[PDB]
Amino acid sequence: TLNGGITDMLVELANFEKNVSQAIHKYNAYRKAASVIAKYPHKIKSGAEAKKLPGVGTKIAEEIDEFLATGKLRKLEKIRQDDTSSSINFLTRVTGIGPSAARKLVDEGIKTLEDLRKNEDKLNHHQRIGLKYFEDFEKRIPREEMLQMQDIVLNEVKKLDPEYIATVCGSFRRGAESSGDMDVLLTHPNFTSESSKQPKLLHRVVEQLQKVRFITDTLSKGETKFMGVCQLPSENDENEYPHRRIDIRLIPKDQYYCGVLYFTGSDIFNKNMRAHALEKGFTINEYTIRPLGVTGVAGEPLPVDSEQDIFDYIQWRYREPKDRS
Ligand SMILES: [Cl-]
Ligand SMILES: [Cl-]
Ligand code: NA
Ligand code: NA
C-alpha cells in the first residue's frame, strides 16, 4: 500500500514470539503497532516520524530506520536462516532415512554439506547402503531403459520352469515416459488359498538373478517380499548406468488377477470403481469379489480366470490401462 511493506514485517515478528519462544505481552505489543500504521493515511519515510503516533514505541521505531535504508533486518532473517523450521526442510536434504532419528542426529551438531563428516559419531547407515547410492536415487528413469529391465527378468523366470507367471505394474503399465522405480508380481499353480506356504519359490528366482550379476544388494528378506538394488550391463561406453531400485512379491494363484488390478488402476480410479459395484450390488477387495445383498453379509467368492471376468460381473464396458486415470 503506502507503509504496507513494514506491516508484512511486523506480522512475522509476532508469530515466532507466539511460538518457539512464547513471550506474551510482547506478542501483544508487536500486534497493536501494526494497526496504527495501517490506518495512518500518509507514507512514512523515517522511523523518526513514527514515535509521534500513539502506537509505535521505543526500540520498535528504531528497527524501522534499519528497514528504511538497506531494506533488510538483523533480528529477522537470523531467525529465518537458523530455525529448526526451514531446516526440517533442509535436514532431511542429504539423508534418505527416517522420521525421529533426525534430532539426535541433528542434535549432534551434524548437518548438510561441510557439516557432514565434521561429526560422524552415529555409525549407522541405511541399512548399510543408503548414504552411498544417495546420488542416483534422486533421478527419474527414462522409459527406454525400463523396457530392457523388463525383458531380462521375464527371460530368466521362464527358462527355470515355464509354469511361472509374472507382470510389472505401477506408472509403467499406465504408459508413462519416465518412472521412479520397478514393482513386479509372481505366481504358480502349486500355491493357492487352501495350501501349505512356500518361500522356496521366491528364493530360487532371486539367487539366479545374482548369478548373472543383475542384482547387486539386499535391503530386506522374508517369506513374501524382497527389497533391493539393480544395474544394466555395458560394452564399454561412459562411466555408468546409475544404480536403481526394485521390489518383488509372491501371491496365491487364485487371488492373482485381483491384486494386479489393485497394483495398477490408480487411487482415484480404484475409488470410483468400488462404488459402482455397490450400486449393481457387489463388494470388491484386494483379495476377492463376493455376492452381497440384503444386509451386512457377503456370500461365497466367485471364480475368476482373467481381468475382464471382473468387469462383466458389475456390468461395465472394459477399459484399457492407458485410460485408468
Ligand atoms: Cl533408516
Ligand atoms: Cl514397475
Ligand atoms: Na527421508
Ligand atoms: Na508417472
For 139, other C-beta atoms within 10 Å of its C-beta total 11
CB 160 within 8 A of CB 204: yes
Query: Which ligand number lies closest to the CA of residue 179?
Result: 4
For the chain, which domains are there? Answer: 1-88 (1.10.150.110), 89-139 (1.10.150.20), 140-262 (3.30.460.10), 263-325 (3.30.210.10)
Which ligand is nearest to the Cα of residue 126, counting in written order? 1
The CA R_g of the chain, rounded to the nearest whole Å, is 30
d(CA 270, CA 323): 13
- Of 260, 270, 264, 274, the closest CA to residue 313 belongs to 274
Ligand that comes closest to the CA of residue 95: 3
CA of 174 to the centre of ligand 4 (A): 8
> What was the structure determination method?
X-ray
Resolution (A): 2.7
Name the grid cell of 28: 501483544
Distance 150 CA to ligand 2 centre (A): 9
**How far is it, in rounded angstroms, from Cα 197 to Cα 24?**
63
Q: Which residues of 96-123 are buried (b: 16+ CB within 10 A; e: fewer)?
A: eeeeeeeeebbeeebbeeeeeeeeeeee
Distance CA 96, CA 126 (A): 8
**Around Cβ 245, how many Cβ atoms within 10 Å?**
18
The bound ligand whose nearest atom lies closest to the alpha carbon of 88 is 3
**DSSP conformation class of 290:** E
Q: How far is the CA of 224 from the centre of ligand 2 (A)?
A: 18
Take residue 187 and report the three cell numbers written for it. Answer: 505366481
Ligand 1 centroid to 128 CA: how many Å?
A: 9
The one-letter amino acid code at 253 reads K
DSSP, res 252: -
What Cα–Cα distance (Å) separates residue 241 from each residue in 151, 232, 236, 238? 17, 7, 11, 8
Identify the sign of the CA torsion 209, 215, 217, 218: negative
Helices (H), the chain: 7-18, 26-39, 58-67, 74-80, 88-91, 130-133, 143-160, 170-174, 200-211, 257-263, 267-280, 307-313
